[PDB]
Amino acid sequence: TTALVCDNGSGLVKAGFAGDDAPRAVFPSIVGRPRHQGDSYVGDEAQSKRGILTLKYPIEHGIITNWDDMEKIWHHTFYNELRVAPEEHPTLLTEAPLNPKANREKMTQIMFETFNVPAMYVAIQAVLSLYASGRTTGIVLDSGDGVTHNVPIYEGYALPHAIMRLDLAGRDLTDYLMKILTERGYSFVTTAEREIVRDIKEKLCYVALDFENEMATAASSSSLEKSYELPDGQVITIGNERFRCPETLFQPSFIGMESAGIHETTYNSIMKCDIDIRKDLYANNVMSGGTTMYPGIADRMQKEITALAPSTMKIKIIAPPERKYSVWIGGSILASLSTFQQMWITKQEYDEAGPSIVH
């Protein structure tokens, strides 16, 4: 039998078969129900029918908060995207770091009681990303759609006391760029327009090695300008917007938040950990999630952590090309191991013991 891997993303579901190199299904973590009851849609079909539906994010901040809609996302995943009978496949689910214990239990209860999977497992997203980089010790920066975490990991296990959470990720950067471009005179307010600005963000944005220098260059030449044709036929040119957008990850004050930036959350996370493991964390900073895809983010992180860390500390930022899917790939690996097969919670163990078995 083939095991399934479902990464329950704040913005995107990544689902597929354990052993595959990439998720076969990548779709928005969105459920749409009729505006007027006289039934649900999920993912791209929900967005297409948005004019007749109310759209909701059941996993908006990395934590599943709407269980009836998460049921719909999982039903869509099994039956519409992967086209499998869930009762025929062990299923690996991902959870956010600091997922409440009752939340993990509800994920377990739905898998067995609603979908009758024969076996399941819940793994921490950041832990899977570390495994996908061939490591069991290191500190992950996972920046997705709705949340960013630092997760220090030692000998295979997250250190929950040192986890840092930043309520700032890719959704917030798209919102910032929407606001910036709207103020420039291009109206970007609707769902369809959010899609356009997201596309501009992913194609043209980058992280400046030195913000102040990059601003001086954009102020004094056209050399950083990039153009993008909108659906209405207008050509928009952006310059400093390209790097002011993701600079928000290092200066959350750009969108009015008092939070530490990702360089300070990474450094604080490491300093919460055993002094004796900090050398290994500094040398093994892995970046995961779509919001770490910006060109220049690894060099910027190298520079910022160097300025914060002891003068002699060896600092390595690992940014794999496949890091949009590294949480999913780490699940594909773990669930493929012979040593993992005894780790599955079976439906039989669930029927004997109930949801508290997941711990």
The only residue of 3, 6, 11, 150 in contact with ligand ADP, by rule CB under 6 A: 11
- Across the chain, which distance is largest between two alpha carbons, in Å? 70
Using the rule CB under 6 A, is 301 a contact of ligand ADP?
Answer: no
Binding-site member from 40, 108, 240, 291 for ligand ADP (CB under 6 A)? 291
Nearest-angstrom CA–CA distance, 6 and 355: 19
Cross-strand bridge partners of residue 186:
none
What φ, ψ does residue 275 adopt, rounded to 5°? -50, -35
Which residues ranging from 316 to 355 are in contact with ligand ADP (CB under 6 A)? 324
78/325 with CB nearer Ca ion: 325
> How many CB atoms neighbour CB 58 within 10 A?
21
Report the partner that residue 76 touches, choosing among Ca ion, ligand ADP, none (CB closer than 5 to 8 A by kind).
none
For Ca ion, the closer CB: 9 or 330: 9
Region binding ligand ADP by CB under 6 A among candidate stretches 3-11, 43-51, 81-89, 264-272: 3-11
Residue 294 interface partner, choices ligand ADP, Ca ion, none, CB cut-off 5-8 Å depending on type: ligand ADP
Q: Does 12 bind ligand ADP (CB under 6 A)?
A: yes
Q: How far is CA 152 from CA 50, 157, 187, in A?
A: 39, 9, 41
Which residues of the shown chain bind Ca ion in the complex (CB under 5 A)? 9, 144
Burial class of residue 353 (count of CB atoms within 10 Å of its CB; 0-12, 13-18, 19+):
exposed
**Does 10 participate in binding ligand ADP (rule CB under 6 A)?**
yes
Structure tokens at 280: 């290994």
| Nearest-approach distance from CB 139 to Ca ion, in angstroms | 16
Candidates 7-15, 64-72, 182-190, 259-267: pick the segment binding ligand ADP (CB under 6 A). 7-15
- Burial class of residue 52, CB neighbours in 10 A (0-12, 13-18, 19+): exposed
| Sheet with strand 31-34: strands edge to edge | 41-42, 31-34, 53-56
Closest distance of CB 59 from Ca ion, Å: 9
**Residue 324 binds what, of ligand ADP, Ca ion, none (CB under 5 to 8 Å, by partner type)?**
ligand ADP
Long-range contacts from 151-158, C-beta under 8 angstroms, 24+ separation = 151/97, 151/124, 151/126, 151/127, 151/269, 152/269, 152/270, 152/272, 152/273, 152/277, 152/281, 153/126, 153/127, 154/273, 154/274, 154/277, 154/280, 156/127, 157/127, 158/97, 158/124, 158/126, 158/127
Q: How far apart are CA 157 and CA 45, in angstroms?
A: 38
If the CB atoms of residues 323 and 347 are measured against ligand ADP, the closer one turns out to be 323
Q: Between 9 and 16, whose beta carbon lies closer to ligand ADP?
A: 9
Count CB neighbours of 212 within 10 A: 7
Rounded to the nearest whole angstrom, what is the least distance from the CB of residue 309 to ligand ADP in the complex?
26
Work out what residue 202 binds among ligand ADP, Ca ion, none; the CB cut-off runs from 5 to 8 Å by kind.
Answer: ligand ADP
Q: For residue 216, count other CB atoms closer than 10 A to its CB.
A: 11
Using DSSP's 3-state secondary structure scheme, residue 135 falls into coil
Instruction: Rule CB under 6 A: choose which of 72, 89, 198, 244 binds ligand ADP.
Output: 198
Q: Which of residues 131-150 bind ligand ADP (CB under 6 A)?
A: 144-146
**Smaller CB distance to ligand ADP: residue 149 or 278?**
149
Can you tell me the distance from the alpha carbon of 343 to that of 338, in angstroms, rounded to the nearest whole number?
A: 10
Which residue of 63, 255, 293, 308 would you call a contact of ligand ADP, by CB under 6 A?
Answer: 293
Least distance (Å) from ligand ADP to the CB of residue 226? 14
Interacting residue with ligand ADP among 138, 261, 290, 330 (CB under 6 A): 290
Contact residues for ligand ADP (CB under 6 A)?
Answer: 9-12, 144-146, 170-171, 198, 201-202, 289-291, 293-294, 324
